[PDB]
Amino acid sequence: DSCIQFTRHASDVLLNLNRLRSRDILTDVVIVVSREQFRAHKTVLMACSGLFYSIFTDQLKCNLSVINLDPEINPEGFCILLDFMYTSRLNLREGNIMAVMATAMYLQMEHVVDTCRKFIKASE
Amino acid sequence: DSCIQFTRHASDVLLNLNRLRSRDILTDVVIVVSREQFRAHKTVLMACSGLFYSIFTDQLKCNLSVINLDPEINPEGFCILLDFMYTSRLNLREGNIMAVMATAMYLQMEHVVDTCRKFIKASE
């Protein structure tokens, strides 16, 4: 086509979605991780994660207001990944890299899994 | 902080939100324009438009599944802006610029209003 494009549009949209999350506006699901609860928007979770995409396209699960993750999932790893989903920023540290990578593999967040693999390989 | 950032994350999120819109997945509102109906996600509309942000933060309107726009709003202008919201691409043409600018002013989409003003000023 002959469209023009606003370079900062996608980033501004994600920034606003994160502001709605902060203020708990229009959040439609609670993710339960080892009795730690995280409120989010189903569409943002689907847009970032192969696991949430599969969950919320399921005819029965699409209607659930609570999703319980596997008990092996670490709440801090989930929190770091939820923050990444809404900001593009990943708080990756020596002390959390194993939990973050395991959570990203479970959530099916391939780009996060890739950078964790590379950061681990650099330290060996 | 000491975060790393995935450059293409925001763009990939918006691309996935547009794929959900195309497939009518988790759309939670219908926008009615001169008897033309557009399905969308309330959060994306809020993230892009000052008008939708005000509408869906209202305690009564946040719960509506149908929103009727002012009858002076042109459906093609709305369609072009809805596409921009989900893609960052604006299909701005000599034949639609007046309708697009009027719709962007009503929707309170300041960056769109700005480029329309500039494109109009270049033609005078």
Binding site: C3, I4, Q5, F6, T7 | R89, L90, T115
Partner: peptide, 4 residues
């Protein structure tokens, strides 16, 4: 704004 840019030409994509």
């Amino acid at each position: 704004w840019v030409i994509p």
